[model samples]
Target: KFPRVKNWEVGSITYDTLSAQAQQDGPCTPRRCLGSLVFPPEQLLSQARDFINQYYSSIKRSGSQAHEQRLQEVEAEVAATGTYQLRESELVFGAKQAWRNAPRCVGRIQWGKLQVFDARDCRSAQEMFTYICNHIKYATNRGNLRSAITVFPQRCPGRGDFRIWNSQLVRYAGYRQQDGSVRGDPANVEITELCIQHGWTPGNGRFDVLPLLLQAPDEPPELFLLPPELVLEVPLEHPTLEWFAALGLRWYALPAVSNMLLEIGGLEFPAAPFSGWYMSTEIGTRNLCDPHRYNILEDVAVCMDLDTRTTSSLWKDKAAVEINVAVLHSYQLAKVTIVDHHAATASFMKHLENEQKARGGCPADWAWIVPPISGSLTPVFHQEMVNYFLSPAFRYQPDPW
Candidate 1:
């Protein structure tokens, strides 16, 4: 009921984050979902100062009078425009930092080269949709996927905020049947209802992409349909197994997370949508195997004629391997880019080494850094990591339901 202040989900919950002067003290529990931190308006100056210095250093403008001039410009702009306008270079630097600082993401090696779209001046939901569609086309790039992010307007003290309701730009809608079973993605059942309540026309397919809920400042959320041409979907099939195509499973070419909030220099952008190329395990390991999701292990096992009754048979484990192998093979044949768990994690290890030299340490969440399919198989599983907070970060926030 208390809107932006805070609310607990599924159950009333809280985590302890301590500092030099935390009233309630403790060893901060290994909180997996670190929600929005307490950001007082007073932090604007302190965080902004840090960001300006970082930006100057990144762009090779150190120890120059321009640094002082840039700081003064930021201060003056805040008074007039209510938020400081980041120049193109600073905006690019901020976007990269946000991705690099993302603790959950395993693909941070390509953080510096991400395509940044600054749509901070979008005035309406329609305009926001346009920027999103453009983002999809460019990132999809036909078969070769590219990592990209489009940042919407920043949070203003007195003004309403811009937000995206869909967790991803593309998602399958879930429908509750009278038998109490969900037809599509059960994880998104709550969001599906919200769309229908708001008068969106839901689709009747397993692979139908959900429309975006574009919420402009103060206005009721608007449903915008994505152009079919803008989205590229890969039809699932296998190289040797011709019967695998009979499953008819498919996924969108791009995985764009649209709902996460991006916090940079104490300013919150509630509508920043970021995209990254998929790791095959994401689709084959969790999405298809999870009991709540497609729940296809039994079906695939039946097709493979594996012994499902006995736990010692390891039928599900064998089925999961083939499923992942098929997905990787299918994408490779389709000319769509996909990375396996071994390759992705090896690359992440390299990123860790580079980041260690570059910034002394790299923040990583063990729960996320380890691949879903093979936790014990990867080298990252054995490595211990210390996670911490950093400015210009991408954070998971409560869904705007």
Candidate 2:
């Protein structure tokens, strides 16, 4: 039986036959449903066969002799050496598929346009730094950002794994003061401490970008500072509120996630850093205003002379909207690629339609697809979705430290 999805706002419904294609079970059963939790690996040969079949079918050559021959070659290589490498075209296809299969990303509308940079030949931390810097430079594109991913060498049945210790390629340093308060992004305090312990001279600013902790196989992670010139940032300012610019807040133009594992054809690339443009709410609502993050909402409310003595005034709500406006205005003035939540959610609706037609269903995490701020205002809020595992995929990994 297929799952029936519905959109309350549009009075539309669709059947998700694609969920039946899920090869692995999610964290759900008859008694309990843990749909919010995130998660894989394999008997290598069968996974390779499935992925090769998927690739061939995409090109309208599912049962061709060449397709069968490629499958045999993959099997033979794995049997002989316990691993097989993906051809460049296959790598490209797999990378895009992973992005498309991602459950948490709301930007899958642009998944097919990603620039895949294969860094499998890299063997040193310094080389990884160079490759990462190039990825930042190219993806940043002087604020007219482009989506890209740099795929490092896959994990073999060998000594150790190549890893990027930072969760994101660009993140602010969080220094814990003696007074027990964090001075920068609180989310990064642990990694920031690790960086300091490893010979990084910590900066005393709120927005100092953290350095890369690149780990080569079986080697201690090496620290590499990103060149400031390559890191494009937009200084936030309100369009009408003149005092807003004096807050001295800014954010990096690129949102490159560096720590996720990219699984393709049963081969795992442990340090594939992928970047896409940011949704404004991610910075304005969550990063800047969340209780554990910068938590600037109360301050902004006070700045606007709003009475925060009671929640009845809705001061927090007003401040959050202005902050989101400031983010949109600043990014636009800076000419950086950023999507407002309304447009992003709207585009996602289009992507859902396209996927429903093409794949019979789309794997979507309803909790994640809905924007953090103004959830009910977004189209995704009213749409029920089916979530399931798919390959090739990007997955969370433990920190290398």
Candidate 3:
């Protein structure tokens, strides 16, 4: 009662330590959409051993003669090939396991249903490009999106590994103007430049899909442009606000991330690009609200008649909700598959219970599992999660030069 002036500090310091640490590659985004991990041989060996033990334990075949046979196979493969190849059954199981093991994703409920395309034998840049085009065409399904992954050859020492340079199979071009403001998605500025440098001409429009930078073993990267017909996109607009269409917002029908590595057992596939449909907030929250990207919170707030002059007015907060709502509404109107955060998180909590019965414990990164908007309102916020490194995980890698 006596000392009532004000607290001097800028922010609260409640937690003793940060909840999650990003891997050497990159941090997981707010939607738990992506994260990265590096591959050194020593870590690969440890991760492989752990994966073998976990795989057998998970099959409930521990201490059986088949278990010893599997272990010997792993040992023999590693000794002979210097890297073990997963059997077809193991590959299918592992692809799903990677999805299930993705800690930050809200779409893990459908993890087991992914179409795992084995493109490991894709030796040429032409084959890699063909695989990706097929993946996009298949996933798009003329707006009824389906989850899918195309696994290319594994990362090996001294061998040129195939990789898709684009973050997503489809993305808008970002052109830096003379004033330094970007015309398209600012998140893709670096990639856009990479495309231009590689000799593909860019379009002046806001949503032109960038070309793919394909690398074949021991060869220089080549540029391959996507067929416009294969790429499906939805023009975004609000139902009540006619002018929302005038803003000319649009997004690709699928969110296929191509830059990350997919690890199954101890081997790494440097060119596994995977996707599920978008969860509206990925576009509404990070893409629009982030300062580096669209940065449209204020523009949207002003359009919605919110007082943008002060922090107390909660203009940003109000605009964010509307934007998120608009994203869901727009996608639904377009007949695209998109999940709202509440529905997504509710489904994730159910996924946790399912995993608890199957895996004894589910690994989750609390920081990523909680919804970016209205954190406390989601059930995952209150639930205690055990996070650990698991094999068959999709991890980020350094961008291919």
Candidate 4:
């Protein structure tokens, strides 16, 4: 059997002796004068190495410079802003005023987007959830006071009517999602009675567990038919005081105004999909019922179902717009920051210099050499000897044929 051919050599040749001997023999040498040939394998290899090094260096330098330019742009923009100060009090006041004037409407919260009610529809749970979600969005738009509302479909034990409760539902289930609807199979129905037991408050026969309702689930669950939990926390310090001060208003002006908003807005935690009341809060906290803090109103709930038209419609539009804007802004900011941080300008300059050296050092008198082989001479022997000596170092292992 014939063995595989693992490798081969290719080259061109030229001869220095032919040119010199022809010049001495006469005014012009014959075509075959002193025929000497040179093989150009080594010269070609050198040229290839130089070309690769130069190409790599050029691209690396260009990339590095681009990053440096990006960093400078970011720095310039930040400088133009002058200062990092944010006016918390005035912004809060504006938000409060906006909420007071906000139209009451009903709509649906589907796929993290709010779909508000139209003038042509009737009152529904979905409409209420939309209204509350809108209210929270407006109030927290300016200041550091962040808030969330959730709604859930639940039966109060013996009560046959399923009432939608905010934050109260999390004690039983975790967070609600777009697919949180009651299906024929109990496994598909999202329920949360457990969260209720742990979240509900005893005083005044009122349930006070809104913050727990806003948080997304920390872990996945094995079964369904559990109430989705939510947790809401004010991410800013002295949030209540800050909100009131920012709005330029006193808490006494609107007695239980926050609670009233929650009631009317239908702000519910673990928001139900198609129907439910809206729930909202001025202040959010992980702990729903800490007696010491009173910034977060526990009972300000609204309805955003089929009935509420004006506010619900606006909410639906705003939800889509706001979510998209936030996502785009975040993505752009991340990309720019990464470019600025990883500037490779200096590294590229070094590479360019190395490329120049390789190109300049290319051999001046490179020649191609080919040994003669005839009937009495074995060409294979010369080839084997040449390969043994000319092959690359230990790092470059040749394939065996």
Scored by lDDT, the top model is: 2
What residue pairs clash in candidate 1, if any at all? none
- Model 1, residue 138: distance off in Å is 0.6
Off by over 4 Å in 4: 1-122, 144-164, 167-401
Residue 377 alpha-carbon offset, candidate 4, angstroms: 99
Cα lDDT tens digits for candidate 3, 1-401? 11111112222112212123212233445577443332325566666766667677778877689877877887777778677777776787888888887766778999879998988778889989999988988998988999999889888877878878889888888999889899888988999999999899889987778999998988888899989899887887887877777878888779999998888877888899998898878888888788888888888887888898799989999889888888888889889899988898899978866775665556677777777788878777776654555567888799777
Q: How many steric overlaps does candidate 3 have? A: 1
Error at 349, model 1, angstroms: 0.9
**Cα deviation of 372, candidate 3, in Å:** 1.9
RMSD to the hidden true structure, all candidates = 7.9, 1.3, 7.4, 33.8
Report the C-alpha displacement of residue 132, candidate 3, in angstroms.
Answer: 0.8
List model 1 lDDT by residue over 56-130, tens digit each.
Answer: 887788758999998988788777766776777777888898888766788887887799888987889989998
Which of the predicted structures, 1 or 3, would earn the higher TM-score when compared with the native?
1
In order of listing, the candidates' clash counts read 0, 0, 1, 95
Q: Which stretches in model 1 have alpha-carbon errors above 4 Å?
A: 1-41, 79-82
What TM-score would every model get versus the actual structure?
Answer: 0.89, 0.98, 0.86, 0.17
- Candidate 3 has what TM-score? 0.86
What CA RMSD would candidate 3 show?
7.4
Top candidate (TM-score): 2
Q: Regarding lDDT, does 2 or 4 come out ahead?
A: 2
